[model samples]
Target chain A: RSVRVLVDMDGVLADFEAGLLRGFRRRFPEEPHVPLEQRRGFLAREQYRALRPDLADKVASVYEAPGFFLDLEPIPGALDAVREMNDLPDTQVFICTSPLLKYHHCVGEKYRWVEQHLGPQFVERIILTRDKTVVLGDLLIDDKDTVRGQEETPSWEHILFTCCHNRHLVLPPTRRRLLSWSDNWREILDSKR
Target chain B: SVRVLVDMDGVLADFEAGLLRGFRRRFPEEPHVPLEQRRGFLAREQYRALRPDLADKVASVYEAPGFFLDLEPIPGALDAVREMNDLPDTQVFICTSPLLKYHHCVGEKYRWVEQHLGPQFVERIILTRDKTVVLGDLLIDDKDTVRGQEETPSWEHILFTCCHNRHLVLPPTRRRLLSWSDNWREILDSKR
Candidate 1:
């Protein structure tokens, strides 16, 4: 059987920096220091609002906000390569991601994001779990820590999508760290040989 | 109190080693022993005594991984032991030479018995590579080595037929034995 490929939506497909930058700048202007690099580890939504308690109501809402996925912008050539990957008859592609569960719209918004960029029926399964490693796949393309370390099954290969935060930690054997998505996405498939 | 020991290899384990298949493979050289008669009556002891010359010719089934693991419980064997265990003065002891490499022998024996027979089925398993000396309420083993022993004598004997000593026959004992009809079930029923 062909191996199943699972892709993440946030760091893999969506440019998390672009959206979060706009949200952080607009929401937390009063805060003295907003790190120049967007990847200083996860800044909790409440923490963002705590700085500017006024926008606390909808401050970090930039995550599932309307324009987030529409102009959500694919990571470099993520759009074209995903199309080529989906064309492989033997290969199966799934959009498995971790988004805030409280904002229930994250799942629906992702389908809309895929349908708009890739095609209406480009992907088959859409699994949404905070803990993605529980869903075993031959390969997983995401930027989360739950899927690493010795305790986790060392069998599955990881594709850590590089951003400012995890760039330093992206070493070999742990994952095939990808900075941008492209036809080079198939590089993971080539490495399997 | 009475306790019964049991044999493993030929009785529960099917160690035919595809002797028939191998015989058929070479039947043309010795056309007298046809393919059909190949594996049928080869004694268990012959496999060990004859070693490489004989064993290599046989089918690979008996030597495969989990060979003993796949063995069926001797017909009514568990039920017989359970029955014997129910006796107010009796216990069931499993004594086997389930061999292993080095110090791992003890752990492997525990795991093997636990995996083959459920964990609780066997209370005490004594695995001695050589059982020249044993002190027990009763002794049940397949080897003839038990023939020459002193002091605490064996109360019962079960001469299980296997390769190395298949030709030897039991020389009568006053203790007790499990003949064809006397399986674990029959033994247990008698206890009740």
Candidate 2:
């Protein structure tokens, strides 16, 4: 009856791209900016590096700035979707996310973000780590496709969350994809049960 | 087939030793408590009672950048953790909490694990405020009570001994691991 789920924060729950874009464009109005459709990968720095190498560090500074993560707006239906999973019988929900290796404001803001948006009670369920593989979970709904660590075979099955950056990705049948959180997520997850 | 959750600060990393060194270096004139005479869960708390004016300054040393990363390991802690990891049916993770002001604490904890324990152990780090939520058979920590949101934790608390936590007498079932080299293996044996 123990069915534990790991929900990723950056692209899956929090609107990291939208938050980053707002900061980047405001600071450098004249610089070339990549629209949502044109974005190919998960990392903004790499995307910015390819688009305009000069703006890579400039784009990164936007997120690395203090209070950037705390101010991030949640993805549409993310709050409801996370609550829905937590409410499900025989299921335990945890926000499994990785802090930027440079942690700085990124780490503390993540905790405050949950407390602010999801309520303080939900803050108890945060699991912060660089490696998702070492943690034991039945399912992990993450936008990141490459979730590798020291553990050769992790317990959790990866559930890809489709976003502008990750939508173009082609995953195997075993790696289930969620097109949207509000639409058919329960139906998709129930089938997994 | 047991999972062990180990604390980072006092148990493995020599947090008290680092602070003592910092305190001596920064303000040699101020009153200092040697590691042997240290009291309470945190040095700041003890210092607050010992010298109220110096409490804030005490916290400042650790809260500063590179503090967590620069901490030396407790004796035999690196080898002890690795030995526990190599156990046939045991899974070991360094389950710890970052400081409330976690600017440097979060990333450095990862770095500390990697620097001392090796890259393979880096994946085993679990950073969370609520130790109760983590699934483990035993939690090795220096705290008197492993306080968290959860009313009932999954794992039993194994108190790792130090000057602050040495006052309490542990039950036979509950472990008080004094020396990492001497009695750490009893953790696995007790479970058996």
Candidate 3:
């Protein structure tokens, strides 16, 4: 039962769309935005960029501003799910995230976010790296449509977390996806183990 | 038999070289310890002796964008690491610190490795403020002591040489890497 489960921060745990879109609406009230319902791509900024290329940088800047990651509300039930996962027998949970290249705020803020939301202990479990492929683990829960890096075959099995952006993907039978934190996550998790 | 963690800045990348260029390029008029005279692990602390008022400004040079990206590799460091990774029983990873203010440091650290070390080594990059949390058999770093939430780190730290940590003496059990070009192969081979 020595399991190491890698959880991604943004979409899997934190409600990135809710917070960023909220920030965008607040920051640029006069402009229109592709709300969560209309959002179509994995990259949150894409539809906004497509709709209004002129305001692309302005839209993207919402996340770039200070306190963006810190203030993000946890995805409903995610906090509880992660806590439960850690409590499971012989399970080691790590928050593995890819930092923004403009990491001035995101890097430090992420630590603060985990400290405040998930408790200070999870801070130690954080591994910030651009390539998740190199991290050794039993499974990785992320919202990215495709999880890939330099390594041809990652040690961890990719658990695609369902979200609006990735809803269209029909993963092969071998791949697994977490529909919601409210689902029989423990059962789904046990299936992997 | 071993998973080795090597620090990026002072160990693999020529951090001081980047700092010196960054500090001098824009603020050439400012006073700086001419490389050889530098001491102490933190460059900001080293500048405090010269002028307390300008230390923050001096520190801002590295805080500025491009500082982490532009570091020139210490001669043979890239080659030595590639060779070390090729060893039958050794695993190499670059464990590094992203500056607290990372506007450019975090991403540039990746870009630096990507451009300099390429994907072969880029996959090995692990960025964290705390080095203690990472699991490794041996950590080759320039920092005098590496600590984090845990006191009993999995890896034994081997102090990598830099003008900053040069003069400090350590107990015999704690390994010291004098130079990557000199005997890095010998040092790492013995660890295995």
Candidate 4:
């Protein structure tokens, strides 16, 4: 059977932290900028509240901004890795992402970004949902420790995709921690063979 | 560009059939209930009320593997969707409300679309709980009986007909809610 690889879009493949910081800066020009490097939590809303209570609304506001998701830059080597995985025999790649719940604009923009950057062919394989754990696959390469506190063990092995916001996330030794896209591609391809 | 919004269950794919199959498999002794006989928008709600002991399991149909994939497409819906996609200056999308509790529904829905509609509509799928929030020119759904009319100002709602929703007295001023085969193509072209 072909090994199904489900990849995350925001932090794993696209430079979401960069886009988020840029959005925060653009939305609140006068507010003190907290770079993503210093951010500690998974949810941006909670991080904003801890930093500046009055500017907490800025976190949600960024999603409503026009072209917020479309303007995001792909993570270095991430797009190539996905394409390479798609071509490799005995491997299937799918972009599984979570859309902003409140903001309708973000849903369509995410598609636009995938279509623009990854080519139209990849658009068909995109899965947008609020919960990533529901998706069944062999490997889910995401930045977050998805099953951190959850009681249910996922069907697929969770591989941590490195990012600034999730730098502090600690995973069990049983799970593999990936440093970069090249490493991820090599590991997955090797395992497939 | 003209935007077209299509529903999943009764509009394109046959969700009622899939729900019936699941219900029959889970509750073998219970008599087969036609979709219209069920009292709620979701069949499981009524089924649970009838059999209190099997509430959680009945609801599991949404989360079941191959449940969404096995849904039979409403006749003419595939051709209508293809025509809508082929039409010039038209943007087509599949807007569905997945049972939020059943996280598997979201993923299975994507697979269902990829299987029936082909890969052309994978990104076009929108998994939203509330259709009111979605922005579009027109929404062709079977939920006019449940949601009644358009709650949001963004789009006009056209009630799509189904076995469960055929008895609904939809507005005469608005186009009469039509069957998937009879009015599917006509209503689509009329909107265009």
True contacts kept of each: 0.00, 0.33, 0.26, 0.07
Sorted on TM-score, highest at the top, how do the candidates line up? 2, 3, 4, 1
The list of candidate 3 runs beyond 4 A from truth reads B1-5, B8-93, B97-125, B128-139, B142-176, B183-192
What docking grade does candidate 3 earn? incorrect
**Candidate 2, A66-93: lDDT as tens digits:** 9899999889999998888889887778
Tell me the tens digit of each residue's lDDT in model 4 across A59-99: 77786678778898889898888887898777777777776
RMSD of each: 22.5, 5.5, 7.3, 20.2
- TM-score (2 decimals) of chain A in model 1: 0.76
Residue range B8-85, candidate 3, lDDT tens digits: 888778889888888888787877778898888888887887889768987888887667777888977888888888
Query: In candidate 1 chain A, where is summed lDDT lowest over 10 consecutive residues?
Result: A146-155
The best candidate by lDDT is: 2
TM-score top scorer: 2
Best by DockQ: 2
Candidate 2 clashing pairs, residues 3+ apart or interchain: none
Question: What's the residue-level lDDT of B12 in candidate 4?
Answer: 84
Q: Could you tell me the lDDT of residue B190 within candidate 2? A: 70
Docking class for model 2 is acceptable
Best to worst by DockQ, what's the order? 2, 3, 4, 1
Interface RMSD of 2: 3.8
Error of 4 at A45 (Å): 1.7
Candidates 2 and 3, the one with greater DockQ: 2
Per-candidate total of colliding backbone pairs: 7, 0, 2, 0
Candidate 3 lDDT, tens digit per residue, A1-193?
5677889999988998888888888989999888676677788766777887867898779888898998999888999999989999877788999777665567668878887898867876788887787666778889988777656778788888988778878988886778899767676567656
lDDT of 1 by residue, B69-139 (tens): 44455555555555566767665656555332222232333455566666664334443332323233445
Residue B102 displacement (Å), model 4: 24
User: DockQ for each candidate?
Assistant: 0.01, 0.28, 0.20, 0.05
